[PDB]
Amino acid sequence: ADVYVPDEWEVAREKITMSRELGQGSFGMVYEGVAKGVVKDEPETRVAIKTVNEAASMRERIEFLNEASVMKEFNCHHVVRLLGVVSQGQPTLVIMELMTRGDLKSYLRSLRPPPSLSKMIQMAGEIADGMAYLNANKFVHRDLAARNCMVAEDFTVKIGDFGMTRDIYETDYYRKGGKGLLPVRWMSPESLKDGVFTTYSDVWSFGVVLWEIATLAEQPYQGLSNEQVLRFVMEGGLLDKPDNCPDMLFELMRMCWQYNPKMRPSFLEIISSIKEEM
Ligand SMILES: CC1(C)C(=O)N(c2ccc(SC(F)(F)F)cc2)C(=O)N1Cc1ccnc2[nH]ccc12
Numbered sequence: 599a600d601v602y603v604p605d606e607w608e609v610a611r612e613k614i615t616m617s618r619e620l621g622q623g624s625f626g627m628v629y630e631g632v633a634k635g636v637v638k639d640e641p642e643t644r645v646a647i648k649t650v651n652e653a654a655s656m657r658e659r660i661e662f663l664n665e666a667s668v669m670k671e672f673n674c675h676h677v678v679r680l681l682g683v684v685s686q687g688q689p690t691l692v693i694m695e696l697m698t699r700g701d702l703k704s705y706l707r708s709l710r711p712p713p714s715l716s717k718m719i720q721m722a723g724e725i726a727d728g729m730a731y732l733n734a735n736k737f738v739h740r741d742l743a744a745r746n747c748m749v750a751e752d753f754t755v756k757i758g759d760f761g762m763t764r765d766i767y768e769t770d771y772y773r774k775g776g777k778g779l780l781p782v783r784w785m786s787p788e789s790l791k792d793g794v795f796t797t798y799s800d801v802w803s804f805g806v807v808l809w810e811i812a813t814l815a816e817q818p819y820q821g822l823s824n825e826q827v828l829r830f831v832m833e834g835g836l837l838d839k840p841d842n843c844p845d846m847l848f849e850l851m852r853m854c855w856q857y858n859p860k861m862r863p864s865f866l867e868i869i870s871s872i873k874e875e876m
């Protein structure tokens with residue numbers, strides 16, 4: 599819209615403190631912190647606070663709240679929970695459940711120096727729970743990667759979005775035609791060719807996340823450039839079975855990377871498929 603209309607999700611600047619720093623978000627810096635009177639039965643609650651650039655335009659501020667207004671509808675334990683908005687005041691804030699172990703790509707890379715089929719299959723099921731929920735509330739994530747999946751103190755996996763502007767995952771984006779950043783290494787053929795983002799194109803990215811878990815977050819298509827990735831995937835090229843990859847997990851990957859998007863499974867079908875095995 600041209601406007602944002604404050605509602606009861608609003609929470610006073612007073613009750614938000616910020617501790618350390620979490621990363622460069624799209625509209626501003628993101629910080630860890632603490633928040634009061636936002637989950638009653640808890641006096642203080644540990645949160646993540648994303649912020650709007652002091653510089654950044656008003657129509658950019660509207661653009662920022664309206665994306666977090668989408669999260670007010672949501673109620674899935676495998677999607678990072680919205681706790682509040684702080685629109686009235688200078689630094690324009692959104693508060694969120696704090697996922698203590700940060701993003702799934704750092705967690706998998708932290709295990710390099712195997713994990714069990716079981717334990718991998720689990721993560722796959724928890725990611726697919728969130729994603730099934732999202733596709734059902736008519737949300738297409740269009741940047742599902744392990745770096746946007748978030749981990750909890752208990753090692754539970756929740757779907758998130760940390761945007762494209764973190765220095766730490768710069769190799770993971772290509773300014774194609776020199777326009778906006780594109781996570782080309784994760785993108786369906788149809789998303790690469792024609793710019794078509796669907797439930798189905800999320801199921802392609804989910805197959806790359808499976809590949810990330812199996813490899814412990816190796817760079818997909820290592821030793822190809824972004825232009826070479828484009829060509830390879832647009833021509834029906836696929837990823838190699840990771841070394842030591844269980845059969846059951848690589849078969850999900852293939853299913854998810856059908857060229858024809860209507861050949862691929864729904865998240866709902868993926869959840870079914872794993873759930874027979876537990
Ligand atoms: C930047 C911020 C804070 C955020 O805004 N989001 C977010 C945005 C949209 C949805 S909606 C969905 F899932 F895409 F459908 C969910 C989460 C995050 O994940 N973030 C990161 C985040 C949340 C929590 N703990 C963290 N630790 C380390 C980082 C981190």
Ligand code: NI
Binds near residue numbers: 675676724
């Ligand atoms: Ni669960």
